[PDB]
Amino acid sequence: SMSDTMVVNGSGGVPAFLFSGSTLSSYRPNFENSITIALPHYVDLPGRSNFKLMYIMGFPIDTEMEKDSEYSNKIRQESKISKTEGTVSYEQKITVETGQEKDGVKVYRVMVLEGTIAESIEHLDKKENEDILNNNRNRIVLADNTVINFDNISQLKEFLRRSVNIVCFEMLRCDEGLRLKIYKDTEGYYTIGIGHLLTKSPSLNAAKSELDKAIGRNTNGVITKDEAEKLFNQDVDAAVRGILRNAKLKPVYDSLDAVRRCALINMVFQMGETGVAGFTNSLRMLQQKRWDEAAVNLAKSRWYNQTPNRAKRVITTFRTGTWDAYKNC
Amino acid sequence: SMSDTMVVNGSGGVPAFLFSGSTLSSYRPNFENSITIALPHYVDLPGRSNFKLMYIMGFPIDTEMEKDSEYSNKIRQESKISKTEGTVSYEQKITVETGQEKDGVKVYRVMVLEGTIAESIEHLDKKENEDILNNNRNRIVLADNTVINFDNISQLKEFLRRSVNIVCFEMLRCDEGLRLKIYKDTEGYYTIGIGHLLTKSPSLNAAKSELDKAIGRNTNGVITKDEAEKLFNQDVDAAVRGILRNAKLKPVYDSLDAVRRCALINMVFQMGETGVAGFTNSLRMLQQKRWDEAAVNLAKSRWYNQTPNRAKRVITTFRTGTWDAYKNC
Ligand code: NA
Ligand code: NA
Ligand code: NA
Ligand code: NA
Ligand code: NA
Ligand code: NA
Ligand code: NA
Ligand code: NA
Numbered sequence: 064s065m066s067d068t069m070v071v072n073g074s075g076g077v078p079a080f081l082f083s084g085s086t087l088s089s090y091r092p093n094f095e096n097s098i099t100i101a102l103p104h105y106v107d108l109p110g111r112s113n114f115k116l117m118y119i120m121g122f123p124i125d126t127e128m129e130k131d132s133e134y135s136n137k138i139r140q141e142s143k144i145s146k147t148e149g150t151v152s153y154e155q156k157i158t159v160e161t162g163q164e165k166d167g168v169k170v171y172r173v174m175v176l177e178g179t180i181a182e183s184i185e186h187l188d189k190k191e192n193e194d195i196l197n198n199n200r201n202r203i204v205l206a207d208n209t210v211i212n213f214d215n216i217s218q219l220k221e222f223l224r225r226s227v228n229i230v231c232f233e234m235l236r237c238d239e240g241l242r243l244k245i246y247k248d249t250e251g252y253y254t255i256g257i258g259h260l261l262t263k264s265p266s267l268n269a270a271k272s273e274l275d276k277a278i279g280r281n282t283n284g285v286i287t288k289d290e291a292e293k294l295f296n297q298d299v300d301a302a303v304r305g306i307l308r309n310a311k312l313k314p315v316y317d318s319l320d321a322v323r324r325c326a327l328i329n330m331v332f333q334m335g336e337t338g339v340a341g342f343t344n345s346l347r348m349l350q351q352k353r354w355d356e357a358a359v360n361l362a363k364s365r366w367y368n369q370t371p372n373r374a375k376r377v378i379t380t381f382r383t384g385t386w387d388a389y390k391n392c
Numbered sequence: 393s394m395s396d397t398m399v400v401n402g403s404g405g406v407p408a409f410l411f412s413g414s415t416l417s418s419y420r421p422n423f424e425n426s427i428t429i430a431l432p433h434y435v436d437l438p439g440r441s442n443f444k445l446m447y448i449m450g451f452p453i454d455t456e457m458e459k460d461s462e463y464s465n466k467i468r469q470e471s472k473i474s475k476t477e478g479t480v481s482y483e484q485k486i487t488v489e490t491g492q493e494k495d496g497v498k499v500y501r502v503m504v505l506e507g508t509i510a511e512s513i514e515h516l517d518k519k520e521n522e523d524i525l526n527n528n529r530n531r532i533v534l535a536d537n538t539v540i541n542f543d544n545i546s547q548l549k550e551f552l553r554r555s556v557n558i559v560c561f562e563m564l565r566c567d568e569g570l571r572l573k574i575y576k577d578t579e580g581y582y583t584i585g586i587g588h589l590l591t592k593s594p595s596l597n598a599a600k601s602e603l604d605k606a607i608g609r610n611t612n613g614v615i616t617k618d619e620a621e622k623l624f625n626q627d628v629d630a631a632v633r634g635i636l637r638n639a640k641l642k643p644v645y646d647s648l649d650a651v652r653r654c655a656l657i658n659m660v661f662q663m664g665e666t667g668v669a670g671f672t673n674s675l676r677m678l679q680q681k682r683w684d685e686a687a688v689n690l691a692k693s694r695w696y697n698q699t700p701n702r703a704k705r706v707i708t709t710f711r712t713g714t715w716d717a718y719k720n721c
Binding site (some may be wrong): 067068069070071072073076077078082083084086087089090091096097098099100101102103117119120121122124126162163165166168169170191233328368 | 399497
């Protein structure tokens with residue numbers, strides 16, 4: 064007929080932009096002739112059940128079908144973990160995929176294959192990955208082969224950041240408290256959650272307006288426990304973003320392990336970025352991993368003199384890289 | 393190891409730009425679920441032996457392997473047709489492919505699937521196809537499943553144009569002669585081949601310089617029969633290019649069949665583009681397919697009066713759309 068399609072190019076699809084962008088993967092299959100990389104090659108991911116991958120042009124495609132097949136996976140179970148408020152334990156590897164599904168067939172491009180949460184965060188922020196992530200369904204395939212389906216890409220990125228930032232949550236809760244209703248801090252300012260300053264305005268309505276903006280709903284000044292975690296995530300993200308823009312803080316931050324990063328973030332929560340940036344000598348000792356020397360030097364500061372109990376806890380965290388000071392808080 | 397590749401994107405390959413550009417194909421397979429178009433689907437091309445295609449994202453891939461396989465073709469035989477000077481009969485459909493081969497494995501993207509030569513010419517000139525054609529090996533798979541391998545894309549395009557233009561060759565040979573050595577035309581000007589004017593200069597050296605430039609070698613004023621065909625192809629191509637830029641000639645040309653196009657090209661060879669563009673009424677009659685009226689009107693012209701024998705032959709070609717006037721020339 065006249066409407067028959069005679070010319071095909073790369074437009075559309077089904078899923079969209081399927082072979083665009085990049086994939087991060089420590090695993091790299093070894094098949095064999097170089098000129099046949101664009102031909103499909105199938106492999107079972109080492110160490111995993113029901114995890115067959117089809118490679119095309121070096122990219123992995125994860126297909127699931129209800130129909131039994133030697134070339135696709137069985138339909139995977141959905142995880143019970145909340146896509147809105149849940150986390151994945153921060154040390155587990157994850158697989159991040161983007162694609163489409165319908166009528167018992169699922170076709171997903173693998174974007175991160177058994178990567179860390181932090182690797183996943185950086186990878187999904189790459190500009191070359193915007194088109195594929197923004198135009199397809201995004202999911203995580205967990206280490207146990209269950210799946211978390213996300214409503215949109217931002218929800219997935221927020222879940223990832225929540226999973227890494229939660230590592231600092233109980234530490235800051237210990238030091239700053241956790242409140243689910245607006246209260247006044249020791250300076251008279253409206254605050255909620257884990258030391259989250261809403262406004263310096265004496266207007267309670269203004270504080271509620273700020274809270275509603277941060278949470279994204281009409282809270283009437285009351286939040287859930289998970290929303291305290293949401294504000295905390297926003298605050299940690301802001302702190303880290305500022306640290307990385309500050310030539311006095313980036314090198315030390317880049318050098319620290321997760322637990323010690325929490326201690327640096329704790330200092331920023333307490334005294335602000337500029338204040339922490341003033342600790343030139345102690346920061347240098349931390350960057351050089353001179354833990355005992357750093358701890359000794361931090362204790363000689365006005366910070367330590369003003370709040371010695373919290374400072375002792377933070378300093379022990381820098382000295383040891385453990386949660387010893389926060390056990391049973 | 394530290395050099396291990398952890399990030400893969402679309403760069404390189406193996407063959408290069410394999411899923412770029414567009415494919416022209418009257419045939420369109422019917423598989424089945426929309427979201428699985430990026431998964432490989434295999435089909436045997438209807439009406440052909442040893443012609444299995446692998447479809448990915450709507451594009452066909454033609455693979456050949458020495459190793460026996462249910463998923464690739466047997467190695468195809470090379471055609472005896474000359475890649476430099478040969479042709480394919482102008483009514484045969486052809487398959488144009490671009491790709492790579494080595495060590496008994498061949499992987500080719502199908503660019504035109506059983507298309508006409510004219511369709512192939514237009515398709516391979518599309519800007520979106522430049523990258524894939526310029527960076528891979530180009531071949532034609534003929535209707536008999538034998539293959540013509542081209543040294544580069546220009547050689548393939550020239551072969552295609554030669555195959556369509558040869559249709560006019562014996563007609564113009566009949567009317568203008570064929571000479572393999574430089575001679576002087578009736579106006580004293582150096583000429584060769586099928587009425588190919590080299591220069592109006594009285595310098596034989598200048599004529600040889602022009603000839604060497606057109607042919608692309610040191611000819612010393614002597615060409616082969618196939619080189620007369622090369623000059624003819626260049627002249628037909630130039631004539632057609634001019635016709636399509638001329639608002640007075642394009643509509644009639646667009647409307648004519650192959651044989652009648654040769655008659656219009658014959659007129660341009662004889663009297664130049666501007667001269668042919670003067671035949672407003674006769675061109676209009678041709679465009680409207682009023683063959684008898686056009687033939688009657690063309691015979692009333694000064695052209696007919698000056699060269700009635702050639703004009704009678706050209707006019708019969710416009711009247712009938714046959715080679716009747718050129719049989720046994
Ligand atoms: Na790893
Ligand atoms: Na690593
Ligand atoms: Na990894
Ligand atoms: Na210091
Ligand atoms: Na056709
Ligand atoms: Na057609
Ligand atoms: Na066709
Ligand atoms: Na006329």
